[PDB]
Design a protein around this ligand. Structure first.
Ligand code: CA
Length: 173
């Protein structure tokens, strides 16, 4: 499509039996049955997974100013909200949307998204506990970026992170 593009370091969308999709992160829909997850039957010992949005309009990547975010997590037997949550803004070189935008780590490791030095932490405040259920609202000092992400860690007793929606928004006003 020609609008914002959701992306993730990893996604459970490889197995033909899976219905998880990274594109469900920014579709406006809050159905529990349309989620992104990085669930695996054999999870990595590194609990980290990142998911984010590349800002686009009329098919071209654009810079936006953002100061607010929304997060909607999901949980079930395998997945949950994360134990740790870092907001980051892209500060790397110019880029295009990854071909493997749901699995850049495994399938497009040369993409600049895969280099941690291309992401800068953004301090933030959330309105409630980081848990599955209600939408969580987040504020931060306004930054300019072409892409934002959340660098997350799964819980130790879970096999992945699950999300129903992720949004970034312009400052108040
Ligand atoms: Ca959604």
């Amino acid at each position: 499509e020609n609008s914002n593009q959701a992306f993730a370091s990893a996604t459970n969308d490889i197995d033909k039996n899976s219905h998880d999709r990274v594109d469900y992160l920014n579709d406006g829909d809050h159905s529990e049955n349309r989620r992104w997850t990085n669930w695996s039957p054999t999870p990595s010992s590194n609990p980290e997974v990142s998911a984010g949005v590349i800002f686009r309009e009329n098919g071209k990547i654009v810079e936006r100013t953002v100061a607010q975010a929304k997060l909607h997590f999901f949980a079930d037997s395998g997945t949950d909200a994360p134990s740790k949550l870092v907001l980051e803004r892209y500060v790397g070189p110019g880029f295009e949307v990854p071909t493997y935008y749901s699995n850049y780590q495994a399938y497009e490791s040369g993409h600049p998204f895969n280099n941690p030095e291309n992401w800068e932490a953004v301090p933030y405040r959330a309105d409630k506990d980081i848990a599955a259920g209600d939408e969580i609202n987040v504020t931060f000092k306004a930054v300019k970026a072409k892409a934002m992400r959340w660098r997350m860690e799964r819980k130790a007793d879970k096999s992945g992170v699950a999300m129903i929606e992720m949004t970034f928004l312009a400052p108040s006003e």
